[PDB]
Symmetry: D3
Subunit: 266 residues, 6 copies
């Protein structure tokens, strides 16, 4: 695993965005061979979407031949609702880049047949072959996507019941009223994420310090699903300063020596 | 993972039996496409076998096209001995249902060539394709089948030396004399069990509280092989009240909210 | 997992050497079907190489049809340097046995294209099919090969930055001057090792007691990569007395009962 | 210790207030023999101060012969600053009850000789003899009073440097401006607290769940000073529901049966 | 502390009995200066009481000037009920030795003022000055006397509510009818025990292995009150083989060399 | 406690030496009221003794009215043996300062009545009243003085059997011949150490990283006696960089800001 120890959220966003751009450009995507990008929502990836849009407007990246897939979506939330993940992605990213509408893949949280919806989402990923880079965040309790505590480490896309802790945390986007936060969500599984060629997790805030510790210095377990990255051949965690407070001095020392040149470029 | 928090062993038995019946009936097994059921012995599954026999006699289930495989068997124990697993299964289940003798698969603990016996048992499972549902219990030390502490998590059917703790616990069936309890047993491996489509573990008693905690809130490790279920895509644990005493309040709270409708049906 | 509890390094060396010989002879290697042996360097395997050479000179083993692959090598260290792993292997083993030079496979730590070197080493292993037995040691921090703390459990051959702790420990071979110890090394990955048919780890000294405990009684995690053996179907650890001091009495008791006949042969 | 498992913060304040009143009335204080009360600031005791005020107004208690000592006080913060603890106490408590000014003992956070201040405070307590009841809260990191992690468990009143986390937590009262929260504070020590006849800690909110777990199920250590209560002969913890989420099921069960009739008062 | 690693419960009783006799004879008690002995009930001290009786019969010890204090007593259980601790002590010990009735101090589990009883017990001990040797056992959950988990480590004699586990454990003596086991009991406190000059705890059976581990290798905490011995200047633990199964190899090794010549007496 | 995070062993000795001198000069000792200093042996305090000697030579301190007490002394080792602690102290300290022979208190490792020796040592300390400052080191297994793991936390001066690990560690001074290192030693106890007014522990080297972690972030327990400092009102730990490698980032951060201006002296 690689851990990029940065200082602020702005730096984190620039590093991640630059990493996404370089992967795409080195890939040289065509209509017959597109780049598949997995994406998350929430407050964590904000600086990354900002930096991505900038680089596109500057002519550094084209999403013309990039296919996207989002991690999850709320069940029973009107698609028009500003806090649905469909609205988040368009407002913060899709509306600003040259990506074709046919290249966008989102889960339908209002699907009449939930099992069928989830299964087809997996079929769609399979038809492309693989997700080259899946970007995500991590929950306070350590969930990756909405794979809450006690989720199988070999799980696929399915419906999941949100933890009370997760709903309280997300209520910040629903006027701070947990009663307005959906109780269920459709989410890619841990196995689905482990199938991606590369996984990049953004970690911001002291609120995520325990989750980072579990991911980096803890054991593999289904209570902190973020620990599944210990089993991935190509995982990267991009962190700000507060989020690294629970790690041992020797651990942080190592990653700082390793990424010194990779980050110190002003 | 799913955890069904019930109160008594009777409820546990009814829930498991009902789950086995619904899986079979939804499967609609034929002679050219049988349902493969993996089964355990011991005191834990007693209420489940009782409920299964009842439902069969009531005309709710037919085992005519069900093929079974047991988890393990004692080495060097005469097949006629009442405490052999061969005798247990016939006395408590086979003698009461319409399952054809050719559909029953048990390990021969008195086989002259142990390696060959174990290998062929794996070949037999493979010829059917897969075990649709494997039901089991858990040991005081956390073993699944007889995969004692320090057993590989990728192990196959083989012979294993029983732990002194396991023999003391099983001596309750041998007049409480550990010297009469066999020292070795043939057992399916952790990998064998992980290959099953669905795994259902029955947990009863405060004596199993530590094992349940290790399985649900602990990390993946070979000392408590029951933790392998964290790596299975479809695992279910059916528990009575005493066995959940070592879990955190928040953990039990979650499963109670999740299975409320799934269990509260009187 | 099997743990062989011996008393001294001499015994450990004899047990491992005898195990390698019996595997080869039972395999009956031909030019069209060679035995693939993975090998380590360092102080740990010294008594094993000594015993192996003896048995060969005594006419008990022929390495004529044995192909070897080493675990790692220092980056930027002249191949002629006495402490390079190339020199170690020839001085301590290759120069004494009847193994053909075309059957020896070592990583080139001075390769101009590191990625290409590592990739080709994996291609070479694949062309043979599999490593039948991979022998290794364990680091003070628990690394297997040079898969230092925080290395993916699904990693392949690649370059790795040595931990300060690892360099201080290895400086004993560089006049006790850490500044002379290389900072990088090419190493087979954890996944590479898990692909071997059988893995045998030699554990010597109280200095390795914590690593043995993590491997045997700890959880699967990427901080102590030696814990990956809990996921291997055929792993063996051969230990001397001091290295077992951190295990529980019951754990050591078990392995002693299990291997009594397998070791007590004077 | 005693753990009072209540559901709401309203019930908590009412239970705690009734307890204080019962101790005072039973003690029957006089001018020559006053009841000595230790008090905290912050949001946690808000419902307790309100209830206490209601009870005094209804004529149930009189503070005419009660002497109070506060836990701490910010250093360098102007006395009449609304967030000073001197201001907090008068505004929320002293302003509404019949307590004489001479019976009020607060630490002078702006004294010339900070060391003389602390020494005199301990002297004041000794002149009265003993604090009969010390009420307090617990911080997210487990600090009791301002005895931050790594504080001696035998400490006395002294100056203390606040942890960054405590300042973020307390920024709520400084317009979420961490820069506005005082960096130092005078505080009674753990030993000062252990000298009290009885200690009652109020625990409210999910953010205190880990601190509650450390205090009840953890070991005594100076990183979570709240753990010092395990050494006190008469400690009580009054909790609301969300704060008990990290405890084991059996732990909460035990306390629920113990205090059943003790909390049915509504 | 001292840990006496013995093999059998027979050796345990003999070692403990010899120790008590040696302390008494060396002390040379008289009417004005008696030796004060603290005693337990239950199955653990059975072999010790027998040996002590044999020694008194052989003329090796006299209890004419020994004063005893028992640890606890069930509340509400009739005095002449065979399972009352008053009955247990006379039947198994007092009936066979020369101890005067006035030298016997037992707690009155059926006293009118339970609080007055406890206070007088502590007073009795103080009138003699100090208990020279307090012998006891340890429960499965680590309780010393009836100071159940979460009991203050500075507690005094008082009334205590038994844990559900302790009642299941003690049901053995109530025809395995948990409903028959008393729910309350008067018990000396941890502080009362720490005031004794010397403490000797008997540990027998595999069921006490975790309690032994907590006492020897764990941290001091109130969940396993037996851990309070780490704070005592003169504590001894006498164990049989199965009770030492959870300790580390080096821990048992250390105690074995220390007490080698100290246990060779057979 | 206070933790002084320094980089080098040279800075450590200088900081510690300056601290001792400041305490002595401020105390202003006289014949009737001497300053009582507790001292250790070994390699850790070497730089401190050198600096102290330089300071005395420069006229900054005088030991004419300082009384010293050493922690321990090997049993059975001849007094004039260069490795005896009596020899170590004179060679490295007493030989170069103006301390009177009568002010020197060392334990007699070769006394006829070893028990009388220990009792008199404690008596000596009491005759002076109290040790004002006790300086010491910490062993790899966390022992303070020679209070090996499982030593009572309330222990007094007595004879102690050395752990095998301590003898391997101390063999450095006996030509790496473990057989030459004394197996027993007279040592002050933990309680003796806790009675001191102030305790300063020097921590140097990566080999003490785990001991430092146990002392600062661990729980109080008798397996790592250095943890007893959490109970001391005035404890200080002076460390070099490598010894802080196992601490959490936030723990070291906290101490770095606290002692910033306190260590800038170079
Ligand atoms: C309606 C709902 O919430 N259903 C989920 C199910 O989709 C999930 O598979 C399982 C846990 O298993 P997993 O997290 O291991 O897949 O829990 C629940 O039954
Ligand atoms: C006779 C006997 O008991 N043999 C078993 C062997 O069958 C098993 O494979 C191994 C542990 O490995 P595993 O539990 O990881 O397979 O231990 C023993 O050698
Ligand atoms: C120059 C160098 O040291 N590169 C390594 C890279 O080869 C390795 O893959 C990664 C950690 O990932 P892994 O240990 O999980 O493969 O760390 C570093 O980037
Ligand atoms: C200015 C300041 O913050 N001084 C405090 C000191 O008063 C306190 O005694 C010590 C920690 O020790 P304690 O918490 O164990 O007393 O830390 C700091 O040196
Ligand atoms: C009727 C009854 O069971 N009362 C006890 C009380 O005597 C004891 O002091 C406290 C726990 O505190 P302790 O174990 O710390 O004394 O629990 C209960 O309130
Ligand atoms: C000869 C010898 O080594 N005797 C010591 C004894 O003096 C010490 O008191 C006890 C451990 O107890 P402590 O460390 O808790 O005092 O161990 C041994 O019996």
């Amino acid at each position: 695993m690689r851990l990029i120890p940065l200082t602020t959220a702005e730096q984190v966003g620039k590093w991640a965005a630059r990493h996404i751009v370089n992967r795409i450009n080195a890939f040289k995507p065509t209509a017959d061979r597109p780049f598949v990008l997995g994406l998350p929502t929430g407050g964590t990836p904000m600086t990354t979407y900002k930096a991505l849009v900038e680089m596109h407007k500057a002519g550094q990246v084209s999403f013309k031949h990039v296919v996207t897939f989002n991690m999850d979506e709320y069940v029973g939330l009107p698609k028009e609702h500003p806090e649905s993940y469909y609205s988040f992605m368009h407002r913060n990213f899709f509306d600003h880049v040259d990506i074709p509408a046919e290249n966008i893949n989102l889960l339908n949280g209002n699907a009449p047949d939930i099992d069928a919806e989830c299964r087809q989402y997996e079929e769609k990923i399979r038809s492309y072959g693989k997700i080259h880079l899946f970007m995500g965040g991590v929950g306070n309790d350590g969930h990756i996507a909405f794979n809450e505590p006690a989720s199988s480490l070999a799980s696929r896309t399915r419906i999941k019941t949100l933890t009370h802790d997760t709903r309280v945390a997300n209520s910040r986007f629903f006027d701070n009223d947990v009663n307005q936060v959906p109780k269920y969500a459709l989410t890619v599984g841990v196995g689905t994420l482990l199938d991606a060629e590369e996984v990049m997790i953004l970690v911001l805030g002291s609120q995520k310090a325990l989750a980072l510790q579990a991911a980096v210095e803890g054991c593999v377990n289904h209570m902190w699903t973020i620990s599944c990255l210990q089993l991935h051949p190509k995982a990267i965690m991009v962190c700000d300063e507060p989020s690294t407070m629970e790690l041992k001095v020797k651990t942080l020392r190592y990653f700082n020596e390793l990424e010194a040149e990779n980050i110190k470029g002003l």
